[PDB]
């Protein structure tokens, strides 16, 4: 359990996979020449994580059918630090449709991928699991991703295979097969991946205009709350820490049923982009505005779920001790929205670093069973569409049958009727 | 038997733009070549040519897009007509034409659609009820032992229904009993101590078939060296399990 | 029609073909015709989201209030979807907001049923 396989899939998928690159090369103070700049040498005990040695490269496999993402990720700022052989991008595009992806054009390039896969795979120590960023909505990610997950999942059985799935809405993007492509995806993710963080782009979408109060919000304006919420969620996974360490350990105590196995990630403060939000908050504030609906990536009110498990993680220098009041407090002051039948299942973590920009910052993963709503919601789109059968033909002409969508439609109500079933469970 | 049918010849209706659609970069081409022929050639026959008709040509072809095209939808109808080869032609996969396909199917058995494991599984049906344990026996021990636990529980299943099926010639000293505990229980202890659930879930239901075939006390000696909790899910397919 | 009882109107309203539209509505094509299922033109592009497709419609006399087979309006279609703005020309143009499908949410039961805050501030606005 050392190092991690990154891999960007689709559009969307290089997008927040980009920025999540520049992000933590420069918490590990590495410039995109591949130099090390840094001054603390905590950034170089678990590098190995995400990097390999030179003469520092990520550990990034980048893939899409369409090679337009791929020269503006070379273009980027961090653009010639990504090793050139690791661009696997095909001829033609998937079109917005999952089938394309999954079943036709992304099937032809998917081998090509599976080399790059196993390449950076062999000089691995000890490989530690996957981690995949893509969108439910589009074509490629959601298509070709699951298909790679898949296919993964059967050449490495043995290893965690984690992702970072944004979820489509009609607040960002107008194409309409999104919610056949996201239970499409969900069908997949439910039962191949271990560990899924929701990344609901209808709630970041509301965090810009309702809390940063910004009205006409742009792709870099979400980008930079997906990048602040991956950095947190793998900070314990970068920085020597003792509690969640690798990636199974985290999926054994984030996971109490296979299933259940999408989480919904908060962070605190919420920042501006290059505004001015000095003043360190206080731990009761990071607590705070930790557990409200407010800082969740996740369109779901946690209100109407009950928290499965929890994992919290504090960084910069702060008191220790202040914390655990805190996150005791939160929890016996709010036990009913916290599972009795799970003992101690909030775990709380700190670091003494703090992400680029703040002296304090907290982020929060929780495995509530709200995720519900996200899934109702989505679920209540697909239908609309589906009992009219619109663009049913994109799919069915590239090889799916029409049962297929009533099969990823019935378990993806089966989920949310299973995050139903232990939300009405009881100690007694 | 019902089977009097006069023997049609298939071989003659392939058309000139065949191969060379079979071997396209366009998937639209492979899928569309092979389909019909399937509902063209194979669909509407029922009795096909046993003499003077060499199929070996028709089933690497076929082997060739099962085993390595990454087309699952070509993968499907292609072993369909696999089936339906050797479902029309009684008696005709003697070696050649059993063994052309035989391992392309084990190796393919990895793919998890309910659909295309079907269509392989049930080539792998019909090719081993006219092909008994000609190269399967030896063949699908050596996939129980593959890196893949996808097509460990399939090919697991897969000596299952062989072995249900499993009436022989007789009277006793068959190529199962000489390879019971050399080899074939020794595989299947593998399925049985697999790292996943489900895995050895399969294993415990071949297990208890096997122990359905031979008298439960000749397998008494592996069962020993298992855990009385394994002993107790293989005891439970045994009270399930029959022929 | 065909096997299903869709028209051209259906087929064009559904799939964003707006010069079809206007063209099949000049020459005098059904405005309500149902299919099968009982879906008008106008059902179908408040289900996709044509706002140019769903004004034409109307000003031909579009029944805005039509229920398919399954009970939905297109005031339930351009919710469900979050076609915010085909929600405010459809009431603009009439659009009963106590329309009950056979589940029996009627518009403002599913803007609360999914939590639609945007469509709150609209539907009763
Ligand atoms: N947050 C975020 N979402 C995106 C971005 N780009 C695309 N998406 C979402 O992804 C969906 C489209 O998928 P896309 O990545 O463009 O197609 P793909 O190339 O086949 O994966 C839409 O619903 C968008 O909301 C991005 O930069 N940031
Ligand atoms: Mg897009």
């Not at chain 3, 009439?94 to 009627?106: E, I, L, R, W």
Request: net charge negative; charged share 20%.
């Amino acid at each position: 359990m050392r190092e991690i396989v990154h891999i960007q899939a689709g559009q969307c998928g290089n997008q927040i996979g980009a920025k999540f690159w520049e992000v933590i090369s420069d918490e590990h103070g590495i410039d995109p020449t591949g130099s090390y700049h840094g001054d603390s040498d905590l950034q170089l005990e678990r590098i190995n994580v995400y990097y390999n040695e030179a003469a520092y490269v990520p550990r990034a496999i980048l893939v899409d059918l369409e090679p337009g993402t791929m020269d503006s990720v070379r273009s980027g700022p961090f653009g010639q630090i990504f090793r050139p052989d690791n661009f696997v991008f095909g001829q033609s595009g998937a079109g917005n449709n999952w089938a394309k992806g999954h079943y036709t054009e992304g099937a032809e390039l998917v081998d090509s991928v599976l080399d790059v896969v196993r390449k950076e795979s062999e000089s691995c120590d000890c490989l530690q699991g996957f981690q995949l960023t893509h969108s439910l909505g589009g074509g490629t990610g959601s298509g070709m991703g699951t298909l790679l997950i898949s296919k993964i999942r059967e050449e490495y059985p043995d290893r965690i295979m984690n992702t970072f799935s944004v979820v489509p809405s009609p607040k960002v993007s107008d194409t309409v097969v999104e919610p056949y492509n996201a239970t499409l995806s969900v069908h997949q993710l439910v039962e191949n991946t271990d560990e899924t963080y929701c990344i609901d782009n209808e709630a970041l979408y509301d965090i810009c205009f309702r809390t940063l109060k910004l009205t006409t919000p742009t792709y870099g304006d979400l980008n930079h709350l997906v990048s602040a919420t991956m950095s947190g969620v793998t900070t314990c996974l970068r920085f020597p820490g003792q509690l969640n360490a690798d990636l199974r350990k985290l999926a054994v105590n984030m996971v109490p049923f296979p299933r259940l196995h999408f989480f919904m990630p908060g962070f605190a403060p919420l920042t501006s982009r290059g505004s001015q939000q000095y003043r360190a908050l206080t731990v009761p504030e990071l607590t705070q505005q930790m557990f409200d609906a407010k800082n969740m990536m996740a369109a779901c009110d946690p209100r109407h779920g009950r928290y499965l498990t929890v994992a919290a993680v504090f960084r910069g220098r702060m008191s220790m001790k202040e914390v655990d009041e805190q996150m005791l407090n939160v929890q016996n002051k709010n036990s009913s929205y916290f599972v009795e039948w799970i003992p101690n299942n909030v775990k709380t973590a700190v670091c003494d670093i703090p992400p680029r920009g703040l002296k304090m910052s907290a982020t929060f993963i929780g495995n509530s069973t709200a995720i519900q709503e996200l899934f109702k919601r989505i679920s209540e789109q697909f239908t609309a569409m589906f009992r009219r059968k619109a663009f049913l033909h994109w799919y069915t002409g590239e090889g799916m049958d029409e049962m297929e969508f009533t099969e990823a439609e019935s378990n993806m109500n089966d989920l949310v009727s299973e995050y139903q079933q232990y939300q009405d469970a009881t100690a007694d | 038997p019902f089977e009097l049918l006069p023997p049609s010849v298939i071989l003659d209706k392939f058309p000139a733009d065949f191969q060379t659609r079979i071997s396209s970069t366009k998937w639209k081409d492979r899928v569309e070549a092979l389909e019909e022929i399937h509902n063209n050639v194979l669909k509407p026959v029922k009795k096909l040519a046993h003499k003077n008709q060499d199929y070996s040509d028709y089933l690497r072809v076929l082997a060739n897009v099962i085993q390595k095209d990454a087309n699952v939808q070509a993968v499907t109808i292609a072993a369909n007509s696999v089936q339906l080869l050797c479902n029309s032609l009684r008696s005709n996969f003697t070696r050649s034409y059993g063994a052309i396909v035989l391992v392309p199917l084990l190796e393919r058995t990895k793919e998890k659609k309910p659909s295309v494991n079907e269509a392989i599984c049930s080539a792998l049906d019909a090719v081993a009820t006219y092909c008994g344990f000609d190269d399967c026996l030896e063949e699908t021990l050596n996939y129980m032992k593959h890196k893949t636990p996808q097509v460990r529980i399939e090919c697991t299943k897969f000596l299952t229904r062989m072995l249900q099926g499993w009436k022989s010639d007789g009277p006793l000293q068959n190529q199962l009993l000489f390879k019971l505990l050399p080899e074939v229980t020794t595989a299947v202890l593998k399925i049985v101590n697999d790292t996943q659930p489900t895995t050895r879930n399969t294993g415990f239901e071949c297990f208890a078939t096997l122990m359905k075939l031979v008298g439960e006390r000749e397998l008494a000696d592996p069962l020993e060296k298992l855990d009385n909790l394994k002993k107790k899910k293989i005891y439970e397919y045994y009270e399930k399990v029959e022929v | 029609t065909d096997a299903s009882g869709l028209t051209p109107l259906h087929l064009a309203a559904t799939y964003g073909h707006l010069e079809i539209v206007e063209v099949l509505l000049k020459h005098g094509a059904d405005v309500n015709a149902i299919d099968i299922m009982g879906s008008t033109p106008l059902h179908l592009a408040a289900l996709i989201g044509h706002l140019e497709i769903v004004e034409v419609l109307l000003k031909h006399g579009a029944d805005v209030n039509a229920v398919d087979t399954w009970g939905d309006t297109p005031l339930h279609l351009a919710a469900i979807m979050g076609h915010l703005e085909i929600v405010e020309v459809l009431l603009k143009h009439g659009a009963d907001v106590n329309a009950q499908d056979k589940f029996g949410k009627t518009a403002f039961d599913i803007s609360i049923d999914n939590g639609n805050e945007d469509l709150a501030e609209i539907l009763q606005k």
